[PDB]
Design a protein around this nucleic acid. Structure first.
Ligand SMILES: [Mg+2]
Ligand SMILES: [Mg+2]
Ligand SMILES: [Mg+2]
Ligand SMILES: [Mg+2]
Ligand SMILES: [Mg+2]
Ligand SMILES: [Mg+2]
Ligand SMILES: [Mg+2]
Ligand SMILES: [Mg+2]
Ligand SMILES: [Mg+2]
Ligand SMILES: [Mg+2]
Ligand SMILES: [Mg+2]
Ligand SMILES: [Mg+2]
Ligand SMILES: [Mg+2]
Ligand SMILES: [Mg+2]
Ligand SMILES: [Mg+2]
Ligand SMILES: [Mg+2]
Ligand SMILES: [Mg+2]
Ligand SMILES: [Mg+2]
Ligand SMILES: [Mg+2]
Ligand SMILES: [Mg+2]
Ligand SMILES: [Mg+2]
Ligand SMILES: [Mg+2]
Ligand SMILES: [Mg+2]
Ligand SMILES: [Mg+2]
Ligand SMILES: [Mg+2]
Ligand SMILES: [Mg+2]
Ligand SMILES: [Mg+2]
Ligand SMILES: [Mg+2]
Ligand SMILES: [Mg+2]
Ligand SMILES: [Mg+2]
Ligand SMILES: [Mg+2]
Ligand SMILES: [Mg+2]
Ligand SMILES: [Mg+2]
Ligand SMILES: [Mg+2]
Ligand SMILES: [Mg+2]
Ligand SMILES: [Mg+2]
Ligand SMILES: [Mg+2]
Ligand SMILES: [Mg+2]
Ligand SMILES: [Mg+2]
Ligand SMILES: [Mg+2]
Ligand SMILES: [Mg+2]
Ligand SMILES: [Mg+2]
Ligand SMILES: [Mg+2]
Ligand SMILES: [Mg+2]
Ligand SMILES: [Mg+2]
Ligand SMILES: [Mg+2]
Lengths: 362, 134, 147
RNA sequence: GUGGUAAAGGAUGUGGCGCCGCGAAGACAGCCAGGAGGUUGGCUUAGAAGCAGCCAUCCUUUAAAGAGUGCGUAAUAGCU
């Protein structure tokens, strides 16, 4: 375990120098009264000042755990060496605190997620893999200790799955699956090829939380404006001196509907409203899906030029391309061994990527 | 609820049985004037009362709406109103005890029981509990 | 024969601290010669142990301060018993710990070298009373006696 | 200019009856002095010092001063 220890120390270490200097600029800032007489200003001041709580304790606590262990650890099979080992068992649940502080920082990491597998380049073979990944991610959820609700499944032509979708019930289901989007490369002799040669195939994967609605809130009076007016066409003297035309304009969007079918202003206002609803509902509905089209913008590559992590069963080895990391047990990987992988590699990269972007050019 | 259907209006003659005395609670609210009090009106006062003393004592509701409220959809004369538009109401005649509060201080009962009076279509009055019993 | 300027109350660890806020703000926006200032602090906490000492600071006309160290607050003494670092969320329904009206006494004697209260008998209700409105009750036996 | 024709609801309009408490051992008002100590009540909160929100009922100097009325500061002190 000496390996993952120095690793967690390395994570906390680069935090040190950066937040080291970042703290010193901020602290002498919080000294002046002129700084505080700017209320909203010294708010975000005390915010960064706050971040120095999670910064300090990690470095301090972890720094001392490295050294102390190193000493009474090197050599002994019985006495004081096994005395020092379970002192780091509590330090192992303190490694726990560290990891939780690196993952939980997603928009909706904490809530359950929704995974979807959709095959790609590779034909009948490509979809055979889609199902392999289905069981893969499914099987992982069982071990993570999570309930899997399969929302939709659709077997393909020969091999079985043109598409599939799942609901990983639990907590941090999203934060955990989050770094599993993108395509996946799969090399092997094709169980469908009459010659059996090596064939690359590609499946797609995506992931998402869950949310609410907004409909009726809009029909609130003060937002729209209703005009009356004489109708048009037939009515005789009735249509003349009887205004039964109605037009509800939805001021917030300008969108409007007008109606003058019946002879009743009340029955016409009733109708217009009932149609403005449906129109206004579709607009707001699109806007919802239009936000998910900007979540397609978060990542939405093609289908086989691009990859994320290769799985070759020939030479036995998976390879997350995002991290350079490797392995040689695609069998185990295609079963659930993801914690270690996702944890470090995926979280690290994902978080450090967007994080360093945000604090350097975003 | 169950009963049956729609019910005639009937008048609100003198507040004879229209009334009572404070049953439970430290204080209460009495009707000075006859009226039909709607379901909505009731709940309005209730939720008001609670909202005032959050996590508070106990509010009793001595009145209860069981008269069906008929009404016509903007038409003329065939049949009796499909009614029930405001839904239901309670016959409150001068004297009746409508709400009992308990487990709070005067300044709380007074205030809350007053705020409630603002939701009711009627002139009202808040009583201590004298002693007059039976 | 002593020029003062402004009283400023701070709570801190005895013999352990740094500028760090809200201490930074106070003596930071009002100046600090913490060289010789924190030199009288280390001796005033040389043989002295740790706690939540409320040192009643009072800036001087030379922009200094009156660093009169005082006995750590009642909440401090109480959690010296239950081994905590806090107090009950809601003094009433919940009760984190239950102590002795005996222990209160010898820890209350620690409090009288600064407190104004005359006798330790009146200093029994004060410390018990602080423990009252902080989420912890007690037990006693002698009390009044009388006829 | 009520009378000479409106409702919830409001207010130190004015008159009359009634109950309660204070005061010549000095009341109400105004006005001079303190108005305090552990305390900075406990809990949350970036912060939460009688004084955001949550929980609540100590004693001491005294003739007197609330774990607190309202303002106010980022939080104080402040004035009350
Ligand atoms: Mg250590
Ligand atoms: Mg050593
Ligand atoms: Mg052993
Ligand atoms: Mg051990
Ligand atoms: Mg980690
Ligand atoms: Mg379902
Ligand atoms: Mg087909
Ligand atoms: Mg099939
Ligand atoms: Mg074949
Ligand atoms: Mg073939
Ligand atoms: Mg063959
Ligand atoms: Mg509205
Ligand atoms: Mg025409
Ligand atoms: Mg015609
Ligand atoms: Mg015609
Ligand atoms: Mg007409
Ligand atoms: Mg007309
Ligand atoms: Mg027409
Ligand atoms: Mg028509
Ligand atoms: Mg929009
Ligand atoms: Mg392609
Ligand atoms: Mg296995
Ligand atoms: Mg009605
Ligand atoms: Mg007609
Ligand atoms: Mg009672
Ligand atoms: Mg009472
Ligand atoms: Mg009202
Ligand atoms: Mg009313
Ligand atoms: Mg009234
Ligand atoms: Mg009776
Ligand atoms: Mg010295
Ligand atoms: Mg000065
Ligand atoms: Mg007139
Ligand atoms: Mg009136
Ligand atoms: Mg009035
Ligand atoms: Mg008056
Ligand atoms: Mg006197
Ligand atoms: Mg004071
Ligand atoms: Mg304090
Ligand atoms: Mg605090
Ligand atoms: Mg104060
Ligand atoms: Mg404040
Ligand atoms: Mg008692
Ligand atoms: Mg000032
Ligand atoms: Mg502050
Ligand atoms: Mg003050």
């Amino acid at each position: 375990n000496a390996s993952r220890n120095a690793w967690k120390a390395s994570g906390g270490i680069f935090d040190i120098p950066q937040k080291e200097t970042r703290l010193k600029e901020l602290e002498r800032r919080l000294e002046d009264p002129s700084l505080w007489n700017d209320p909203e200003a010294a708010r975000k001041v005390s915010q960064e000042a706050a971040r120095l709580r999670r910064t300090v304790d990690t470095f301090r606590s972890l720094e001392s755990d490295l050294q102390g262990l190193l000493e009474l650890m090197e050599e002994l099979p019985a006495e004081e060496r096994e005395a020092l080992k379970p002192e780091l068992e509590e330090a192992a649940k303190k490694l726990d605190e560290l990891y939780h502080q690196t993952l939980l920082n997603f928009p909706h990491a904490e809530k359950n997620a929704i995974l979807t597998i959709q095959p790609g380049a590779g034909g009948t073979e490509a979809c055979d893999w889609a199902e392999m990944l289905l069981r893969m991610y499914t099987r992982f959820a069982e071990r993570q200790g999570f309930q899997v609700e399969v929302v939709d499944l659709t077997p393909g032509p020969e091999a079985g799955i043109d598409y599939a979708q799942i609901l990983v019930k639990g907590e941090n289901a999203y934060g955990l699956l989050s770094p599993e989007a993108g395509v996946h490369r799969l090399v092997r002799p094709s169980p469908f090829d009459a010659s059996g040669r090596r064939h690359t195939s590609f499946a797609g994967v995506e992931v998402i939380p869950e949310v609410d609605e907004e409909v009726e809130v809009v029909l609130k009076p003060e937002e729209l404006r209703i005009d009356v007016m004489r109708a048009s066409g037939p009515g005789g003297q009735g249509v003349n001196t009887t205004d039964s035309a109605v037009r509800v304009v939805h001021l917030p969007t300008g969108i409007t509907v007008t109606c003058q079918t019946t002879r009743s202003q009340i029955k016409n206002k009733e109708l217009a409203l009932k149609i403005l609803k449906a129109r206004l509902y579709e607009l707001e509905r699109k806007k919802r899906e239009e936000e998910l089209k900007a979540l397609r913008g978060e990542v939405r590559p093609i289908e086989w030029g691009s990859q994320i992590r290769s799985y070759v069963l020939d030479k036995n080895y998976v390879k997350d391309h995002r991290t350079g990391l490797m392995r040689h047990d695609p069998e185990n990987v295609l079963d659930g061994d993801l914690m270690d992988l996702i944890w470090a590699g995926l979280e690290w990269k994902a978080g450090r990527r967007q994080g360093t972007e945000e604090v350097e050019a975003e | 609820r169950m009963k049956y259907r729609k019910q005639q209006r009937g008048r609100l003659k003198g507040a004879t049985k229209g009334g009572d005395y404070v049953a439970f609670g430290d204080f209460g609210l009495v009707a000075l004037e006859p009226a039909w009090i709607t379901a909505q009106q009731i709940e309005a006062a209730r939720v008001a009362m609670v909202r005032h003393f959050r996590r508070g004592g106990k509010i009793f509701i001595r009145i209860f709406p069981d008269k069906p409220y008929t009404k016509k959809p903007l038409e003329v004369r065939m049949g009796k109103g499909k009614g029930n538009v405001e839904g239901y109401v309670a016959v409150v005649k001068p004297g009746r005890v409508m709400f009992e509060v308990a487990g709070v201080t005067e300044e709380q009962a007074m205030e809350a029981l007053r705020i409630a009076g603002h939701k009711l279509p009627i002139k009202t009055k808040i009583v201590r509990r004298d002693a007059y019993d039976e | 024969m002593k020029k003062v300027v402004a009283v400023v109350k701070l709570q801190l660890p005895a013999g352990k601290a740094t500028p760090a806020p809200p201490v930074g703000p106070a003596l930071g926006q009002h100046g600090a010669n913490i060289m010789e200032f924190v030199k009288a602090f280390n001796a005033a906490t040389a043989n002295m142990g740790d706690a939540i000492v409320p040192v009643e600071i009072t800036i001087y006309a030379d922009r200094s301060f009156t660093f009169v160290t005082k006995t750590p607050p009642a909440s401090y003494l109480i959690r010296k018993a239950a081994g905590l670092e806090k107090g009950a969320h809601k003094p009433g329904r919940e009760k984190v710990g239950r102590i002795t009206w005996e222990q209160v006494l010898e820890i209350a004697k620690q409090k009288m070298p600064d407190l104004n209260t005359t006798d330790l008998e009146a200093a029994a209700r004060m410390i018990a009373g602080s423990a009252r409105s902080m989420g912890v009750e007690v037990v006693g036996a002698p009390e009044v006696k009388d006829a």
